[PDB]
Fold:
Amino acid sequence: PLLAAPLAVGDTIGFFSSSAPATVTAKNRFFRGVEFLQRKGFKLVSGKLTGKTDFYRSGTIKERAQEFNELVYNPDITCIMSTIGGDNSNSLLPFLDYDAIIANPKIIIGYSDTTALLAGIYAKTGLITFYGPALIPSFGEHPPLVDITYESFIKILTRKQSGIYTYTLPEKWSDESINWNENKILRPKKLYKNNCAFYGSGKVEGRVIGGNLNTLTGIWGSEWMPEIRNGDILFIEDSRKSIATVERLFSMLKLNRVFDKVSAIILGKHELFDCAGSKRRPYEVLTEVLDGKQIPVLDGFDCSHTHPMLTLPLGVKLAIDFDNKNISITEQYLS
Amino acid sequence: PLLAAPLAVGDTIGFFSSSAPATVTAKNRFFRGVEFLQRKGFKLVSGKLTGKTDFYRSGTIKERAQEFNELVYNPDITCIMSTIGGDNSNSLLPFLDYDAIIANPKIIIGYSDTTALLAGIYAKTGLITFYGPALIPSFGEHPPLVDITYESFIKILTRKQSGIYTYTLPEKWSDESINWNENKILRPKKLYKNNCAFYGSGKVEGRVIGGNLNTLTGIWGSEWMPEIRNGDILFIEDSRKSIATVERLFSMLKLNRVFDKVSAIILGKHELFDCAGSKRRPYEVLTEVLDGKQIPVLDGFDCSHTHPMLTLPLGVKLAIDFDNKNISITEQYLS
Ligand SMILES: Nc1ncnc2c1ncn2[C@@H]1O[C@H](COS(=O)(=O)NC(=O)[C@@H](N)CCC(=O)O)[C@@H](O)[C@H]1O
Ligand SMILES: Nc1ncnc2c1ncn2[C@@H]1O[C@H](COS(=O)(=O)NC(=O)[C@@H](N)CCC(=O)O)[C@@H](O)[C@H]1O
Structure:
């Protein structure tokens, strides 16, 4: 695969708004995120649509593609980071400068709607992109959880590429929709013990593919959707969905023969899942959809909309040890 | 194509709940729909999940598939009608008895989420199915709008298959979210003049394909999504969506090269579209996404979630005369 240069303390991070104009609509949280990374020693380059609004989005399709492309053209930038997701990143895909991405590989990082770009860029270029922090939701998070997010971010992107990397498990996590865009917290978030579960036995090693599942529907069937292959590990997460929507998306995967191919599934923790009073969890819904197909599942990986968030390279081999309850990166993902 | 026998007054209609359990949650409107069709002279057979609830759905995936299949097996049933949509019809697709459908073709009719079934059945069998009335939302509607819906339903399904059929445009329509499941009415719905627009010139004739666009994402890429071919007329409608979602869905189509194949697009009236203050309509968003592609568009066809609703056969040729501002069925769609 195509690999970007690793991150280092003091590097320049460029940010872009490929969908929701949250540098305006969540300006306080944005400023907190900016200050957080600056105090860590990073230099920041603001994308050209920072501070702009086109109602539900940061700008036109072409304006947003231009914003992203301009960061790719900047030789000083090591990391290109999403400000926030939304709904509309998939629009940009016909207009991204893929040749420039290949010529100037950089760390591309974000999550949620930005999945369209992460997956699309990988499909077109083979570049290993990252499911991880977006500036506003991830680094604008109040302490204590932001520190754990940062620890993963800096560890994954700066570590020496020697031997496997085994993930730490966050001690506590939260998904509460509070403390969003103000100077002070209203009150501390509920801190849940980590209830991540490893359903299965032995070790499964394979290329990880996926991201935000709802977002994948916007690129599905196109040349920008990476082909899922035999032996892949499917990584999927969703946010604030009804159980009805979760069944729909799982069945979509079933119909597409995804569950005939993959050797394991990683479910990211689902932020504020709405069970409609059924008290069922997404894993139970997946089990029904699977219809007896035995696939080992890591249920509740901390790489999703919940806090804290781990950083995950997409398109490289992972090993999930279901016996020892851990997950590792086993393939080089940066230069 | 595989063609069902035409409907006749006095025939038996079977109904099924492939997703939301609205025979329970909208019981008053359900009873109104039942009484409406019975008064017209139709006999009704209730699917086995009528009156059942599994929280967000009528029952398990397999039970819902069985409910539908049992109606196919009933020799007295000439029309199989959805009670209502939801989110979860796509789950049923691996379990529908397609061979039984081929062996005894019937009129299959519904809309919204039921698109998954209409499209899936067409993909597997070539049966001409119908985008049209569901028992609860369509026939549980209060007069006067229900009468116009019924007029189309009965005309399309009972008429002699000789010569083209040209649609009659409803004089007035509504999308107002009142008088749903209430026993009585305080006032009639606000009525709007029909603002259907024909953007283009000349005449376009091609096979119509599509349905509820959001629902199509649940079957996309699979063997149950009928292939869109050169010359097709794309029919798409959505309900209660944000402009953000609408851009995402239009861009999905663009990425899939759909706009390189279609001869025209029909946009169904979008029930309670949320423009996010932009004052933009779906057509304007489509125009941006198209990026200069000169595809003629029928904007605001009355075959969607708005009232009244016309009945449309899927998978047969239509002719849209953009100069004379009309739309016709030009291919035999019942035996
Ligand atoms: N006013 C508010 N109050 C408190 N939390 C808020 C918020 N606005 C955004 N958030 C939180 O910010 C996180 C990231 O938002 S985000 O990136 O735009 N999300 C997305 O793109 C995905 N929701 C799109 C995919 C989908 O679900 O269909 C989400 O986890 C979301 O919970
Ligand atoms: N409580 C309520 N008050 C007033 N109206 C209500 C209602 N519950 C349902 N409705 C109306 O019923 C109509 C049909 O509903 S329905 O078939 O389940 N819809 C669907 O399946 C599609 N919404 C799913 C596709 C999608 O948009 O993602 C929709 O037009 C909807 O407006």
Observations:
- Chain A touches chain B at residues 19, 54-57, 60-61, 86-88, 90-91, 93-94, 217-225, 242-245, 247-249, 251-252, 254-257, 275-278, 288-289, 291 (CB under 8 Å).
- The pocket of O5'-(L-glutamyl-sulfamoyl)-adenosine (ligand 2) is lined by residues B 20, 84-86, 112-113, 137, 177, 180, 212, 214-215, 238-239, 271, 305 (CB under 6 Å).
- Residues 145-158 of chain A form the longest helix (14 residues).
